[model samples]
Target: WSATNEEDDLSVEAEIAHQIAESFSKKYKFPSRSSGIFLYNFEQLKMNLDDIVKEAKNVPGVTRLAHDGSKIPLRCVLGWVALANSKKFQLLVEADKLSKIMQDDLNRYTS
Candidate 1:
């Protein structure tokens, strides 16, 4: 029943997770490695759930919004994973741009 109209309920649960991630992000990461975790932003994900669902629906991909992992309907994970992936993707793109600019600066210096 959490198919479409249950966006609020889904968002509620998402909100909780998001807040947790926010706190984790602010207070996580064990010195960049050396027994640290991967992407340890635990609750920063609490934000933008509303926006993500809207964008997800309006987008082209036919990612399902409702399904069953336990033989009963459950609000899907598409938005959550997609949003996280999108964040990671943006970070990579930003890093790439920074590298390109720096690389060019060094390129001219070395030549």
Candidate 2:
């Protein structure tokens, strides 16, 4: 049963990885040959954002960027570039709005 469990876990990981890869392709225009490292980083960034939101809710009287002040914006910027390069104008516009939202939230906490 241990071997079966390992196989099940591996399959689950692979499915998640493939989902990430598909998102990257659609949203970022990533080529199929792109390294898994990029997908991993994207996943990590998303997790970081989730954590940031949780922290903001849990704490009071003080707030800060998820991992310093630059990470979220940086990811958004990179995402913008990818969207732009791929001619995904609608998504680009949505990304712009999201970036603004993130900036506004940060400003609220900081000042």
* Per-residue lDDT of 60 in model 1: 24
Model 1 Cα lDDT, one tens digit per residue, 1-111 = 645757645644454344333344343221122332233232344445565444333322212321111110111122233334456433423333434433444344333
Q: Which pairs of residues have clashing backbones in candidate 1? A: 18-43, 18-45, 18-46, 20-42, 20-43, 21-42, 21-43, 21-44, 22-43, 22-44
Give candidate 1's error at residue 26 in angstroms: 16
Candidate 1: list runs displaced more than 4 Å.
1-42, 58-89, 92-111
Please give each candidate's TM-score: 0.23, 0.24
What is the model-wide C-alpha lDDT for candidate 1?
Answer: 0.35
What is the per-residue lDDT of model 2 for residues 1-29, given as tens digits with 9 covering 90 to 100? Answer: 35585565445344433433444423332
Ten contiguous residues minimizing lDDT sum, candidate 2? 31-40
* Count of clashing residue pairs in every prediction: 10, 0
Which ranges of candidate 2 are over 4 A from the true structure? Answer: 1-3, 25-111
Best by lDDT: 2
Give the candidate number with the greatest TM-score. 2
Tell me how far candidate 2 lies from the true structure as C-alpha RMSD in angstroms: 15.1
